[PDB]
């Protein structure tokens, strides 16, 4: 199916800077990428769909970009409370396939 691939898997940035998570698909996914964020010990929250459209109330510092098979999620002014697992997910054809997550550690 479309196989979503995330690497790196652990990332660190200090408070205030940018980090940019990379996610990649196995075939043209035609800008159908969703990004969830799963805060440690909580449920996933939908951050961005169609690669850039932020959902109701996810702050502008979170910005999605991407095209073809390459997508990337950026967070600016990393907050201490931004520590979490970030998953990308294709939403172009069933089954919906998620990337393996990337952990954000705050340096």
């Amino acid at each position: 199916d479309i196989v979503m691939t995330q690497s790196p898997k652990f990332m660190s940035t200090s408070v205030g800077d940018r980090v940019t998570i990379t996610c990649k698909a196995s075939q043209d996914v035609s800008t159908a990428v969703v990004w969830y964020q799963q805060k440690p010990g909580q449920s996933p929250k939908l951050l961005i769909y169609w690669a850039s459209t932020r959902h109701i109330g996810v702050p502008d510092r979170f910005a999605g970009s991407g095209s073809g098979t390459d997508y990337t999620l950026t967070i600016s002014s990393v907050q201490a409370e931004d520590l979490a697992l970030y998953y990308c997910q294709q939403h172009y054809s069933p089954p919906w396939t998620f990337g393996g997550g990337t952990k954000l550690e705050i340096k």
């Binding site: 800008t31 769909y49 169609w50 850039s52 459209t53 932020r54 959902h55 109701i56 939403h91 172009y92 054809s93 069933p94």
Partner: protein, 389 residues
């Protein structure tokens, strides 16, 4: 009728919608010879209303339906078949060859325009009265496209909106004013609209209103209002926070009358609206990310008010079912004090969300206004992707 049509009435009050036509194309085409189509619409002669759509040159069941996700090829043609029959190999009629069209009846006979060719050398030839009258070559060399719903005429003049150039940027939109298949005049897009795609139009009281698609930055829709008598136009966006393109950001509280509403970029769906003061209804997908479901909401003064919110509504396809392109048409030769607003929804089926099959195809639901407040039902395409396996 044997005389040109003049848009002398205004809309009728829209207080709910009633079913006008239903295809059932894909459910019947599982055993009969139905053609794979896409980009449907409906258009009325003085004499009859007929369903219109772009065909793909194969039947759903034949092996050549593999690959019909593709938009334009040289086996697409604009066909016509009777209201609520499926588009059969045996009862369809080809109006022209091409992969983008518009067609309308001026009162005496009808204009049909098909566009064709490679993306860098496309042509439009305008058929008037089942004979080719005029042709127009490409002007910006990048997929010359047009309406995908009917054009509207007033005293022989039928404005037609074409776009040539990027879908991800500035493109070259022009309004052409044909009469008897000849070009009277044409002009560039003028107004605050940033990009134009697949306009859905209707006319009343000597003015033609088109609701279109901003594929480059809008989630609110551009409106073009054309004066067929002076042959001029203006463009703006629907002021309402009830955002109606798809995909879209979540509806705000204040909209944007002169600019694209920001959020989804480089995407869209064809859609329509009856914009008539308090009598305004808007159509939109129920889903924000996909072509599923379809509702009609009454949002009074949506065109001009940046705080317009719905006050009545109607569900046409449930969000658990697929929808697709929508557009407007009216029976201008219907008897009576006003015009009955009608619309159609394209119900897309197949690739890419239902990839278990290799075709993309669709069926039609159309509704028309009533002044009664009628009960609502929903209207699913209806086929089971599992019986085609």
């Amino acid at each position: 009728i044997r005389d040109f049509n003049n848009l002398t009435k205004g809309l009728c009050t829209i207080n709910s919608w009633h079913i006008y036509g239903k295809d059932n194309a894909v459910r019947i085409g599982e055993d009969s010879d139905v053609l794979v189509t896409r980009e449907p619409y409906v258009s009325c002669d003085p004499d009859e209303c007929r369903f219109y759509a772009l065909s793909q040159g194969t039947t759903i069941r034949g092996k050549h339906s593999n690959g019909t996700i593709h938009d334009r090829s040289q086996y697409r043609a604009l066909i016509s078949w009777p209201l609520s029959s499926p588009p059969t190999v045996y009862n369809s009629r080809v109006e022209c060859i091409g992969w983008s069209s518009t067609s309308c009846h001026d009162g005496k006979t009808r204009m049909s325009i098909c566009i064709s060719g490679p993306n860098n050398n496309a042509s439009a030839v305008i058929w008037y009265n089942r004979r080719p009258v005029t042709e127009i070559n490409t002007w910006a060399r990048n997929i010359l496209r047009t309406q995908e719903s009917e054009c509207v005429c007033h005293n022989g003049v039928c404005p037609v909106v074409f776009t040539d150039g990027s879908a991800t940027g500035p493109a070259e939109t022009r309004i052409y004013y044909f009469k008897e298949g000849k070009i009277l005049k044409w002009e560039p897009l003028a107004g605050t609209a940033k990009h134009i795609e697949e306009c859905s139009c209707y006319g009343e009281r000597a003015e033609i209103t088109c609701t279109c698609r901003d594929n480059w930055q809008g989630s609110n829709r551009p409106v073009i209002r054309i004066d067929p008598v002076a042959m001029t136009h203006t463009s703006q966006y629907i002021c309402s926070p009830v955002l109606t393109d798809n995909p879209r950001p979540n509806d705000p509280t204040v909209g944007k009358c002169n600019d694209p509403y920001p959020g989804n970029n480089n995407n869209g769906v064809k859609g329509f609206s009856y914009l008539d003061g308090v009598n305004t209804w808007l159509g939109r997908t129920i889903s924000i990310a996909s072509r599923s479901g379809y509702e009609m909401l009454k949002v009074p003064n949506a065109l001009t008010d940046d705080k317009s919110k719905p006050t009545q509504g109607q569900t046409i396809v449930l969000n658990t079912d697929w929808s697709g392109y929508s557009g407007s048409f009216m029976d201008y030769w219907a008897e009576g004090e006003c015009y009955r607003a009608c619309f159609y929804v394209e119900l897309i089926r197949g690739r890419p969300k239902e990839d278990k099959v290799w075709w993309t195809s669709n069926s039609i639901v159309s509704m028309c206004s009533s002044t009664e407040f009628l009960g609502q039902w929903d209207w699913p395409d209806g086929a089971k992707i599992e019986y085609f396996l």
